[PDB]
DNA sequence: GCATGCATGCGCATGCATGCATGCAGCATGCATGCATGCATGCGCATGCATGC
């Protein structure tokens, strides 16, 4: 504890053009991969992207890696 | 003086601008049904955790 790892993650997420900062249990399930929603404007079925889909061609920053679910860890794998 | 003919008022029918109610119909408004739509309910099922042994 207290060696400034999280500050480094915050900094590296501020320097990258595309980069997302997420914490262990606050981003679980469809908040990582994708979700099914209906588009209000075009009346079509879309897929909403999660953190991993927002950081495509970028850097993803995950904090408290040890606390995540097994399902979330499979996706990272 | 006397005989005559025209203008003026009296008497009689008729038409006609106002005005208003009633029965019938034409006419538009409000109502009943019927349905499309998207949201929220509540309900069993699978997963991840906290507890006991
Ligand atoms: N080497 C360091 N240099 C500067 N600040 C540090 C250093 N180590 C820790 N800190 C400070 O101490 C705190 C550590 O918080 P954090 O980044 O969450 O540490 P950790 O990731 O280990 O939990 C922050 O305020 C950070 O600025
Ligand atoms: Mg930390």
Tell me which residue has its CA closest to atom 27 in ligand 1.
Answer: A4
Query: Which conformational region is residue A47 in: left (phi greater than 0), alpha (psi within -120 to 50 degrees), or beta?
Result: beta
State which ligand 1 atom lies nearest to the alpha carbon of A5.
Answer: 21
Classify burial at A29, counting beta carbons within 10 Å of its beta carbon; exposed 0-12, middle 13-18, buried 19 or more. exposed
Cα A39 to Cα A11, A27, A50, A54, distances in angstroms:
34, 23, 16, 18
Instruction: Please state the atom number of ligand 1 nearest to the C-alpha of residue A7.
Output: 17
Instruction: Give strand pairing partners of A19.
Output: A59
Q: Is the CB of A71 under 7 A from strand B?
A: yes
**Residue located nearest, by CA, to atom 5 of ligand 1:** A4
Asked whether the beta carbons of A49 and A9 are under 8 A apart, the reply is no
Q: How was this structure determined?
A: cryo-EM
Neighbouring residues of A65: CB distance < 8 A, sequence distance ≥ 6: A24
Header resolution in angstroms: 2.8
């Amino acid at each position: 504890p207290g060696v400034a790892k999280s500050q480094l993650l915050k900094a590296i997420c501020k320097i990258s053009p595309r980069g997302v900062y997420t914490t262990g249990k606050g981003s679980s399930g469809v908040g990582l991969t994708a979700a099914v929603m209906k588009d209000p404007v075009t009346d079509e079925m879309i897929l909403e992207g999660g953190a991993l889909v927002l950081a495509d061609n970028g850097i993803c920053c995950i904090d408290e890696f040890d606390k995540m679910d097994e399902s979330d860890r499979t996706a990272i794998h």
